[PDB]
Amino acid sequence: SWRDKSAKVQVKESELPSSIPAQTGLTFNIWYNKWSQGFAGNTRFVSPFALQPQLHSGKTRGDNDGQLFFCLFFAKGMCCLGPKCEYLHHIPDEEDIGKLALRTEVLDCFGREKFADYREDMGGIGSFRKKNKTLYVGGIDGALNSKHLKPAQIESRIRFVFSRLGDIDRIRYVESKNCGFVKFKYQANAEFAKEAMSNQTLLLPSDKEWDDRREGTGLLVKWANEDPDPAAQKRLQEELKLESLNMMVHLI
Amino acid sequence: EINEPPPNICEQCLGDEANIRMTKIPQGSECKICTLPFTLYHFKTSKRSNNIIKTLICVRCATQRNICQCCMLDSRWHIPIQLRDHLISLVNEENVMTEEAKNDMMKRFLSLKNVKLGGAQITSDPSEADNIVDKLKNILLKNPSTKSFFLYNIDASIPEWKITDTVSQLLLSLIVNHKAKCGGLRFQSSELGERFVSKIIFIIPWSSTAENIKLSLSLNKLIQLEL
Amino acid sequence: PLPTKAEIQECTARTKSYIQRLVNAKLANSNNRASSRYVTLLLNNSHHIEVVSKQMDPLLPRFVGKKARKVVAPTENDEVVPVLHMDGSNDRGEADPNEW
Amino acid sequence: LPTNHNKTKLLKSLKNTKYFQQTTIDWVEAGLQLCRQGHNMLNLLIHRKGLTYLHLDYNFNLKPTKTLTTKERKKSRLGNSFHLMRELLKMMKLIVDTHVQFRLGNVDAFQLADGIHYILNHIGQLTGIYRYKYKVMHQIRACKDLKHIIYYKFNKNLGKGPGCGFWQPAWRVWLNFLRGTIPLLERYIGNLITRQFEGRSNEIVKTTTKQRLDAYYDLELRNSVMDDILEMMPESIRQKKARTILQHLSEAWRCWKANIPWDVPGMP
RNA sequence: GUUCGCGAAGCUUCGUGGACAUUUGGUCAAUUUGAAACAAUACAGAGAUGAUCAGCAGUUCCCCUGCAUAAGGAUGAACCGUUUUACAAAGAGAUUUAU
RNA sequence: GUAUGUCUAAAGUUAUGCUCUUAUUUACUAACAA
Ligand SMILES: O=P(O)(O)O[C@H]1[C@H](OP(=O)(O)O)[C@@H](OP(=O)(O)O)[C@H](OP(=O)(O)O)[C@@H](OP(=O)(O)O)[C@H]1OP(=O)(O)O
Ligand SMILES: [K+]
Ligand SMILES: [K+]
Ligand SMILES: [Mg+2]
Ligand SMILES: [Mg+2]
Ligand SMILES: [Zn+2]
Ligand SMILES: [Zn+2]
Ligand SMILES: [Zn+2]
């Protein structure tokens, strides 16, 4: 278990990467940390690190404290503070979700405030106005360096990746749209994965494009608008009703 | 302007201490709703609690929604605003929404208006709240060691977490597609599979009016495959 | 009745207090520390709490919030008010427009 | 007469807070650190503005990197606040650098003294301070005068040459100039960084000036006339019917200008 | 750990009761996905009017540069589009209906 | 030649009387040549 052992360091701050990405332009902008005098070509790239959770997850300063938030850099798999980190280092569970359930309405499991609206992409941390648990998973074409895999193969690999990080409500790959819709058990979990597999690789050691994983462009894990499909809409409605019955009985 | 309105923070949120010491930065942030300066209040719930609680939204916004300024929940019932609006829509009415305008200028404008939104009109006056509650209440009343199964007859609404937890109770991996319902369950060992089977909407073969069920499965499966 | 002297003292006291406070607010608001020298607890339920103002670094902006937003005002004329003129001119009122 | 009520100094105020600490640092260290600090500040400001194409040199001599597009050029005309700040830092950077040189084993103390003196008497010639704030000519002139005075009390029996130091009175001049300007720059750069952070005020309203006096006058006039006519007019006519009125007025004005009588028949 | 009282070994040492001192900081957390802005390549290249020119205004839920209530951004930009009813009264002719 | 203004800068949001052929004018425009 995670609770059996202390959390290992993801990567030592020597191994950590600098804040000077890619020279996308002609000159560096000090107050922005971005580049400038040229926006030729796309910015995004593939994460060097990944949350290998059983090899990494463990105790922290936080697990002593009762810090209610998980380490963004743990999710990214690059936390340079291992056991000395205040933010936690393990997969969110019912106990921890339950623990922070008050605050998590307003903000993420990464302890950062949600907003009125989704960022037009549905790309950034979720809005407070929706309690979404469903991540859109674009850029699979890019995430596998143009590997002509089977849809079954794709969906299975996706399953392997996101099931590892959180309890699944459902997943469904769409051949016609080349993307995923990865509904989660909890919003905290959803948040965690959404960072934990942002800019990651779907590739594996068994695959031949393993050393070219860095060179492509990573998974585009964003948030999902609810489907137009009335097949699931009805289900959603039913769920809402059920939940409402719970709370309403709880009021008295 | 003058600090005329007081902050609108709820109890649960704020924590069970007789006296906390919070700080107020006036004109201290744009809110999370209406992009508009307001007096940001914040406090650690306990002295040694690491998480500060800062007042996300502005007081006008809070009043408007009739909510907490830190929780974003109704100050009465401590529940999500959308959810409470749904509840209100359900009892006594058919339609009660609280539409926030997603355009940066208009949101400000809306915030400025001293007018309660749909659900807020109910929950403000406690009498009406009580009435709503009572109305709601009224409304209420053979083991070959395969380690790998293929489960069928899966209710469309059921989630994988429910399944796996059920299995655990009766005790790993799992694959489900709600289109096909070809629940490609796989156990971490064959001995575990044996244990499970020996321990036994649970239609369960061990591949590696049931007829009509098979047909329904069939067509659905086919459709899934075409997708 | 021309207003009572005592009540004038009241009004003056109220409004003077108000405007002095407003001007103070205006002054301590502004970045010019020069104009800081012309400046003339709570409970959020039955539950009780101490409010404080933490002094911040005098480099960072004093009021991070304010950023000169354009904001349209809602009128908030919730109460209706008449516009109420008493006349009915026919002879001069119709003969005039031909001239006007 | 210095005003007495304001007995909360700047340093005192800063001391009161937590965010400052105090140390005993060598004056050269203070200087160098302040050049570094100043450089970081100005670069931060410039980059914040967006115009990364203006490269600050470490000697506070600003210049553009690329040839500037007209838009870019317009953007990059930094005002009399930022440039003035730069110039003061340039001044400081000079003398501090000279001290560094002295102390870095390069130059003798006499050489240092002469260097400092040279800097003070040639602030004009070493940093275009005058460019931005021209009243600094007074200061420059004063320094020149001092030099003229000093030298000819310093070179009575001694011949000509550059080797005089004695930088005191000029230094005094510069200190008093800084005293004068510290308020001005607090205001100026205050407003500047406020604009960088908060947007500029959108209640701009322009005053009258010699340049826009006439236009304002005439608009006020036509507003008055229009008002009067509406007051007069018993039907309560539309704004479009006021257009006819004011246009009529305009024509009348022109007619008057011509000395052609303005006798339109159909009017009341 | 200092010190002030006590006890147990030799003014020295081990144990005991005190006094002193007794709540830091965070609105933030390390790169993509919570927000800049130009830049480049391409395309056009500027208000009156025939043509060439100075402008100053105005409205704007547009701003930028500027210390700015100077001024300047092409007269800073956009304004040039769309456009039906407080709809009446009178007469004549034709059609229908009724008495 | 410019101000200025648009444009591009890549990842897939889960629903079933005429045609013709020419030659000439005039005008405007043209950082194209003289
Ligand atoms: O009068 P200014 O224009 O300020 O110039 C003076 C002046 O030179 P001129 O007389 O040629 O103008 C001084 O010369 P004297 O009158 O003293 O002969 C000379 O002083 P030194 O002779 O002591 O050199 C000084 O030069 P420096 O700055 O090297 O001391 C120089 O100032 P500029 O060099 O700035 O013109
Ligand atoms: K102008
Ligand atoms: K104008
Ligand atoms: Mg011009
Ligand atoms: Mg011009
Ligand atoms: Zn960590
Ligand atoms: Zn609350
Ligand atoms: Zn608000």
Residues of chain C with C-beta less than 8 angstroms from the C-beta of B103: none
In the numeric block, which tokens belong to residue D14? Answer: 């800063």
Closest nucleotide (C1' vs CA) to D217 is: E57
- Region at B151 (left for phi over 0; alpha for psi -120 to 50; beta for the rest): beta
> Measured between alpha carbons, how far is B86 from B100 in angstroms, rounded to an integer?
15
Interface contact flag, A31 D53, Cβ < 8 Å: no
Q: In A94-178, which ranges are E strands?
A: 134-138, 168-174
- Residues B99, B129: Cα–Cα separation, whole Å: 21
Q: From 3.40.980.10, 3.40.50.970, 3.30.70.330, 3.30.365.10, which CATH number describes the A134-223 domain?
A: 3.30.70.330
Q: Give the amino acid at D17.
A: T
How many residues are listed for chain D in this entry?
268
The residues pairing with A135 across neighbouring beta strands, listed in sequence order, are A182, A223
Closest alpha carbon to B56 in B73, B40, B75: B40
What is the C-alpha to C-alpha distance for residues A103 and B70, in angstroms, rounded to an integer?
A: 8
Helix axes D213-232, D239-258, angle to 10 degrees: 120
Phi, psi at A168, each rounded to 5°: -95, 140
User: Token digits for D220?
Assistant: 């006020």
Q: Which of B227, B108, B123, B140 is nearest to B178 (CA)?
A: B227
Which residues from chain D sit within 8 angstroms of residue A29, using beta carbons?
47, 50, 52
CA-to-C1' distance for A25 and E41, Å? 15
Phi, psi angle pair for D97, to nearest 5°? -60, -40
User: Rounded distance, CA A108 to CA A92, Å?
Assistant: 12
| C-interface mutation test, from D17, D37, D48, D196, most C Cβ less than 10 A away | D17
The secondary structure of residue A221, as a DSSP letter, is: E
Q: What was the structure determination method? A: cryo-EM
Any residues with CB less than 8 A from the CB of D224 and at least 6 apart, and which? none
Residue nearest to nucleotide F2 (CA to C1'): D70
Contact criterion met (CB below 8 Å) for A164 and A248: no
Please answer whether residues A140 and A154 qualify as being in contact, where contact means their C-beta atoms are separated by less than 8 angstroms.
yes
Resolution of the experimentally solved model in angstroms: 3.8
The runs of H, that is alpha helices, within chain A are: 53-56, 62-65, 72-76, 94-100, 140-143, 151-163, 187-196, 230-251
Spatial separation of the C-alpha atoms in residues A247 and B79, rounded to whole Å: 8
Joined tokens for residue C51: 């409010």
Q: Would you say D54 and D76 are in contact if contact means Cβ atoms under 8 Å apart?
A: yes
CA of A111 to C1' of F13 (A): 27
CA D155 – ligand 1 centroid, Å: 12
Question: Residue C30 has which token pair?
Answer: 């502004």
- Concatenate the DSSP letters of all residues of D159-202 into one string: -S-S-----HHHHHHHHHHHHHHHHHHHHHHHHHHHHHHSPPPS
Residues counted in chain A = 252
D159 Cβ closer than 6 Å to some ligand 1 atom: no
Angular region, B49: left φ>0, alpha ψ -120 to 50, beta rest: beta
A251 SS3 class: helix
- The secondary structure of residue B52, as a DSSP letter, is E
Distance, Å, B106 CA → E59 C1':
21
Token couple for B10: 């709820």
Rounded-to-integer distance, Cα D176 and Cα D189, Å: 20
Q: Which residue of A has its CA nearest to D52?
A: A29
**Residue ranges near strand F (C-beta within 7 Å):** A 39-42, 44, 121-123, 134, 136, 138-139, 141-142, 146, 172, 174, 176-179, 181, 183, 217, 220, 222-232; D 69-71, 74
Q: Which chains border A (3 or more CB–CB pairs < 8 Å)? A: B, D
HSE, side-chain direction, 13 A CA sphere, residue D205? 2
Ion ligand 8: residue ranges with CB closer than 5 A = B 31, 33-34, 36, 58, 61, 111
Dig out the tokens for D93 from the structure: 């950077």
Measured between alpha carbons, how far is A126 from A133 in angstroms, rounded to an integer?
9
3-state helix, strand, coil in chain C (%, to 5): 40, 5, 55
